[PDB]
Amino acid sequence: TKFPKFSQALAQDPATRRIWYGLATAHDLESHDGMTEENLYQKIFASHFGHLAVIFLWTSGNLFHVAWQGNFEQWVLNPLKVKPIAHAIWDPHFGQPAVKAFTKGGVSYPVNIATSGVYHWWYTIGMRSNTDLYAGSLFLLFLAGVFLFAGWLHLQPKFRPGLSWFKNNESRLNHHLSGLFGFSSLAWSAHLIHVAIPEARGQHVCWDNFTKVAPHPAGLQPFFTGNWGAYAASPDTTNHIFGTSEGAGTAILTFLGGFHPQTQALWLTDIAHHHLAIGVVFIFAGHMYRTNWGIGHSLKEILDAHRPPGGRLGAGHKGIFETLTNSLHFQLGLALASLGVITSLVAQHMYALPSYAFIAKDYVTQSALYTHHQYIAGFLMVGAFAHGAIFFVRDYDPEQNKNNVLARILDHKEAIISHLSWVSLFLGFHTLGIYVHNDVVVAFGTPEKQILVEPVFAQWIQASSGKALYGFDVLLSSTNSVAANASSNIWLPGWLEAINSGKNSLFLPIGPGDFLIHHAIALALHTTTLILVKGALDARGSKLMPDKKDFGYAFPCDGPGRGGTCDISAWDAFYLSMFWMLNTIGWVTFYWHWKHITIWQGNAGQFNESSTYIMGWLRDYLWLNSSPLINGYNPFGMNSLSVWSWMFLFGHLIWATGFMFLISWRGYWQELIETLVWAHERTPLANLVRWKDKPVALSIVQARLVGLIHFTAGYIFTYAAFVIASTTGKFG
Amino acid sequence: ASLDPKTGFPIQGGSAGCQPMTQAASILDKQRTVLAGKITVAANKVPVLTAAVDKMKTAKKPKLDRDYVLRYSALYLTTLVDAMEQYCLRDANGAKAAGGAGLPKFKETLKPASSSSLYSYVDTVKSGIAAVSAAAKAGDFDGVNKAAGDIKTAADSFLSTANPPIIFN
Amino acid sequence: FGGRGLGVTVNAERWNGRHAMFGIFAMVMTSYMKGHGLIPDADKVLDIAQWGPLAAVWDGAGNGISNERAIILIAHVHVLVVSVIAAIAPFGFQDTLVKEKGYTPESPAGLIPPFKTGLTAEAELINGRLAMLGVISIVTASLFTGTSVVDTINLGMGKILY
Amino acid sequence: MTAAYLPSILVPIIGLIFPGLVMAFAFIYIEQDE
């Protein structure tokens, strides 16, 4: 009767709904009883420090478990042959065949083999021994403690920040651009130049010697003379064996481009020069805003003055400053949309341009990292649109936003939504129709009749960056071009070697199957956007429910009247778009993984011929690659893919269990539960035990969430088991 | 009384009381046990290289892995020499190498690691690194094995004459 | 929770005192016990074939718990089952771990309880505070000096145990 | 493995005692009225 102490409406509920709803509304601090704005921003600040610490404890845990139980020192000796160990297994349910089957990695105990790539990342950035992985784990435990104490400290009465501090947009932007983005990128260049570059070249540099070991033989004298090009002189040779002194140069900043020939990763001197460039740029960008000394920009002044004189945007951005600052949901939506695009950039640029030594030969790690970050990307992008819907319901004031960009977006909400409906339908009808055309014609024994459309626009883009496969002779592909001549002395020789060589995932060859799947991804991104945009724009009202704002973000329905109002809330369009997010990241990761496993065999033509129809995707990707995974255990034994073999079935179960919450709805279950309440009260020896909370069926919104969680968890666990076990079992 | 073969930490406790408040050991002695433990770990990883080279030679078609031999040299052999040079530095100049002259810097103005009684063993290990690399380029399996053995003998000899104080602390 | 004698209370001080005096006895007794080799087959590694996967340890040699460690654990399990039965079903006269919600918390002892040479509560609390401190002293001494806890117990008492 | 005893000591504690205890306490806290 007092668990949701933040909610008296839930704390007086006599049912089991109180526990569920108190657990599910716990982090929605804005909705808590008697919540002021001061207390809202100060609890968010302290709980952001708790998230900071959880991240640091998670990273310290990965470092500790690899330092303790991993084979990092064995792996760094021979990184292409040794399989990295994540942590050991102590499971009292194992049989002795299971214990023997997981005893890989060169150790004497069962282990999980790491798919996270942390070995390649820690190898590349300098770590050599278990002592420094452990030292990193210790330092992160200290930092986690520092940020937990900071979270407690900024909850103390003298140390409580005011709302004037929390909304100082200019000082926060100045410091996050110049200190958090820029100076830490500059400090990361210092780590590469001072530690990672020398230790990639055999010379150990630690805290014990880094003030008496110069990164460059000349040493901070060329920098303080303008002779900066002396830091690019004598780069690492193509004969360099990573981690050793043979083939090593003395340069610490280069723009060679392409990849280190042995590790098949970006040059660490390119990465050090990248973070130096991006650091200075971000530091300069962090001097943009006026704080205390009269130079800089006021964000209010910039936003108010950007109204085009033609009047096409109305009042423009007048009043957008206040809306953004006052609305934490508008900020969360901008932050999550921005972050979601970046983790999609992270997934796309880390497989094509890997930075870590001897990764991109760890095919399981490449598949897991790409799949992981694309799923994180889809979650962040859907959440951005969710919090835009929450912004419109909760924080958007139409009077304060008269004729703005925001009001005028709502004014044409139907033009936006109907054109997203058109483009979704357009793409879906044709992409599916071309795929079905191809399936029917191939089935009828006539593969030639297939509508195979070359991806010429993308091929032109590849050629424009120097791919010579398509013979476009555009820009970099043409030897005598202004673009080619300009970059010839700096990054083009390495880039042309990297792009033209077929040993890397840089600008991988694209054909008709690639075109069709890209259009499928376009239908998926447009359809998820349609559902999310329809939810955000119709969040505050619709013809079916004009006063939808008055009911909130997440409500079940408005009842069976007016024809029926199931899934009418903006939350329910989040709910419906979550399936479309899962479907699109499914199409993306299925495409990435199938194209890569076919290239990794040396059989890229198998994707080229089978991806243009859907039975090729069914038999040649899902059915063909299932066999190492589903044979992880059988009546003839088991091997170390048994865990993924069990997880794959576990994902199928959770996913299907989600269907129970999504297909079967409340009234059936409340009528079951009332017969169980009768039976418990009428059973002798059992009616001595009484519930404190009346058993009720799950709510309409709660069951939609429970089915969505089960569907999503089943989706993730099934695909993670498949993408890891098929790649591990195949090794290619 | 000795240092652990793998982790390199003090092994047993066995008025010079080990307990912190009553410890009679200097920070120099504690730095020396740290360096000696690191020397112990690097020297005891020499059998692992010897076993790997034997596996390479007895294979159906045998090739020396220059990458393995050079990466092992970079990871352990260079570390063994630097730890021994630091122990020689502390033995010769004294407290100054312990931070008495300040932060590690160029032109530290302290007596060099050479002119130490224990430096000759460091010269032996440096010759061993050169032989390990030369044999790896040559493809000589026996050369790598003997060179690693020379390093192992030199490091054990260093520790025996050093008699490092083991500070359990 | 706190209103039942749990937390930083004198009830908890007394109970942890009783457990630390017993623990000092058990540490001294196991030091004497394995010093003379009176634990049978102390080094013998238990086989997973008889005991199952709970016996696995992952120590490079043997891959199993030793028989000594299992025997000390079974001694602890005996007094844990006594502990659970005494916690849930105490004696009529015994002091109870979880006091009734409406109880009178005993006055805090202070820096030093009054000294009574008999089997008194004050004597129990004094010895209990000493034993809890003693547990910390031995655990830190063994940790700091890199010696087994059995060995530092033997060393403190002048090797009387073995 | 060094400290190989710790996985045998902690994994049952973290995996059985920790949930049991925190579930028991969570149950007491959610059900309690004052």
Partner: peptide, 30 residues
Amino acid sequence: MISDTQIFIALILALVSLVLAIRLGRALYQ
């Protein structure tokens, strides 16, 4: 390799982090 003493130092620092986590959670809960 990592000593048992090194693991114990890590466990000490994680206990300190646990106590600071309890203190932050109680402060956030009020």
